Design a protein around this ligand. Structure first.
Ligand code: HEM
Ligand code: N5Z
Length: 392
């Protein structure tokens, strides 16, 4: 049979097959869960080529009749969300609202992490570091960043186990949740009490004549999409980074003893992270040579992030965490090119503060079950354990 993607939902180890593929066929034909054919790209060189050539288009993946990685979970126009934000003149305001350096935000993150951890310690081991630490921390962070009530976070969070599904077919619950969450964000924009964060700023610009013909639809869409992408990405990254750290007691102890090394540690944890369950999809808008393959206009290309990030040509001894690499931020964990993650700095800070807090409170943190007992979520856009049971 034609090789099927994805290879494994496990986020604790890279399949031996990725390295064989990278060496022998760094661009290779595969079949996606929809039955469509696609080109899987797995070397640093070819992954960077695709992501830096805008003729491999994110927007066009949404075209009717295209070969699909998975079913849309947002309206087709929303696949071009960042381009819509740019065209509306809103990129700078969005970026300023989501920087980790906003006054009080870092201290809020620290206080929230420490309170979550104190609750776990009071209750006693075992603790679930995903559902009762990493995801709540992500959720609290994004409510603060958006300027919305903390008590609204849990309901918004509960859309995400459906919103970020990677499904062969359209998902009826995804539309129900999308429409409801859009209505929530539209109400937020009409709420005079919402004056801070991303939604407070968007509410102001919505009433500013310089933005008078931006649609109410776009303003609410920004709220739903930034909450969803930010929460799912940060909660999932921190969860799987904590596994990688628990798997490395020598590194855990070093970062505990020398917390000034945590930023370098988080950068390597980003590099080796397996959180993205599928390659990043793009549709060719011209015939383009990629390695030994002439990709044809209309074909689907999938950029495998761990293909690039474990490439031994670019990252020697790729499975080893090294805090002194000469090319440390040159990984693709945040993508590359036109669609580079707009939340990258906030995502770094969320993980840095979360790990700093956990190592101080739980220096002896260890898995409370054998690692093979973790239950890896399937048919999802991220690789995550359903529960992360730890002791300390
Ligand atoms: C460790 C945390 C995160 C990781 C690993 C991550 C990863 C990524 C990656 C790989 C992309 C590129 C997708 C592509 O090119 O197809 C991306 C884009 C995106 N990220 Fe993140 N992200 C993180 C945190 C965040 C946060 C905190 C936010 C917002 C608050 C965010 C919002 C977005 C959005 C809206 C896009 C789409 C950009 C576009 O279409 O041009 N992400 N992210
Ligand atoms: F009910 C729902 C349905 C869908 C969503 C939803 C889906 C996708 C994105 C954004 C993906 C872009 N992206 C690429 C890499 N990381 C992130 C945002 C929100 C939220 C609630």
């Amino acid at each position: 049979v034609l090789l099927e993607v994805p290879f494994s939902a496990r986020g604790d180890r890279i399949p031996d097959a990725v390295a064989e593929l990278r060496t022998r066929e760094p661009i290779r034909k595969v079949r996606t869960i929809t039955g469509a054919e696609a080109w899987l790209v797995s070397s640093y060189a070819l992954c960077t080529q695709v992501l830096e050539d805008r003729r491999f288009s994110m927007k066009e993946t949404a075209a009717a009749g295209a070969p699909r990685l998975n079913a849309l979970t947002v309206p087709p126009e929303v696949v071009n969300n960042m381009g819509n934000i740019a065209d509306a003149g809103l990129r700078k305001a969005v970026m300023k609202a989501i920087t980790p350096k906003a006054p009080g935000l870092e201290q809020f993150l620290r206080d929230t992490a420490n309170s979550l951890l104190d609750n776990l310690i009071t209750e006693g081991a075992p603790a679930d570091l995903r559902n009762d630490f990493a995801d709540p921390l992500a959720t609290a962070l994004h409510c603060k960043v958006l300027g919305i009530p903390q008590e609204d976070g849990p309901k918004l969070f509960r859309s995400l186990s459906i919103a970020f599904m990677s499904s062969a077919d359209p998902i009826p619950a995804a539309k129900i949740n999308w429409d409801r969450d859009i209505e929530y964000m539209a109400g937020i924009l009409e709420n005079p009490n919402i004056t801070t964060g991303l939604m407070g700023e968007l509410s102001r610009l919505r009433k500013d004549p310089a933005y008078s013909h931006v649609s109410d639809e776009l303003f609410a869409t920004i709220g739903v999409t930034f909450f969803g992408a930010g929460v799912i990405s940060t909660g999932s990254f921190l969860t799987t980074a904590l596994i990688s750290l628990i798997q490395r007691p020598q590194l855990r102890n070093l970062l505990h003893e020398k917390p000034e090394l945590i930023p370098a540690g988080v950068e390597e944890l980003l590099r080796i992270n397996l959180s993205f369950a599928d390659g990043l999809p793009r549709l060719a808008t011209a015939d383009i040579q990629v390695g030994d393959v002439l990709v044809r206009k209309g074909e689907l290309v999938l950029v495998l992030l761990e293909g690039a990030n474990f490439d031994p040509e670019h990252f020697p001894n790729p499975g080893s965490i090294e805090l002194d690499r000469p090319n440390p931020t040159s990984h693709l964990a945040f993508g590359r090119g036109q669609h580079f993650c707009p939340g990258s700095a906030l995502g770094r800070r969320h993980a840095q503060i979360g790990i700093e807090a956990l190592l101080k409170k739980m220096p002896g943190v260890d898995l409370a079950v054998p690692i093979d007992q973790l239950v890896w979520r399937t048919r999802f856009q991220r690789r995550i354990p359903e529960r992360l049971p730890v002791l300390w």
